Amino acid sequence: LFKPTHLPISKPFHALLANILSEHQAEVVMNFRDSSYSAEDGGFHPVEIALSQSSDGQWCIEYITDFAYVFPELERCLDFDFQRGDFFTAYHGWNPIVGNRDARELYQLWESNFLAYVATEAFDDISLT
């Protein structure tokens, strides 16, 4: 139903995505928010994920962005941009994803964390647009 990218996106992550699509279905942007998250209380970083519906029928993950407070505003914190083939961190800057090992480990850790947060209902506000 989703395929494919150069990062090891998990079956559980596809299942989360798949679930939220059809839950709403009965080009798309998902937002995950912890309404309590503040600049010096902490909480869980908001996450945005973008998907578009392919020509052949199956969905494509466009990008994944995790935002955090950095006078504080929300800045991209981690970004995995599949459309463009780049990832971002405030430390790493922009680097290509393909055969890149920092990208892989960073993504696996990010995704394991995010899936834990979701499964324990860390986000009181999940919207689809």
Domain ranges across the chain: 1-129
Q: What is the CATH number of domain 1-129?
A: 3.10.450.430
The closest of 83, 84, 85, 78 to 107, measured between CA atoms, is: 78
CA distance 68 to 124: 17
Lookup: tokens for 98: 């393909």
Method: X-ray
CA distance 58 to 44: 30
Cβ neighbours around 85 below 10 Å, total:
15
- Give resolution in angstroms: 2.1
The closest of 16, 6, 91 to 47, measured between CA atoms, is: 16
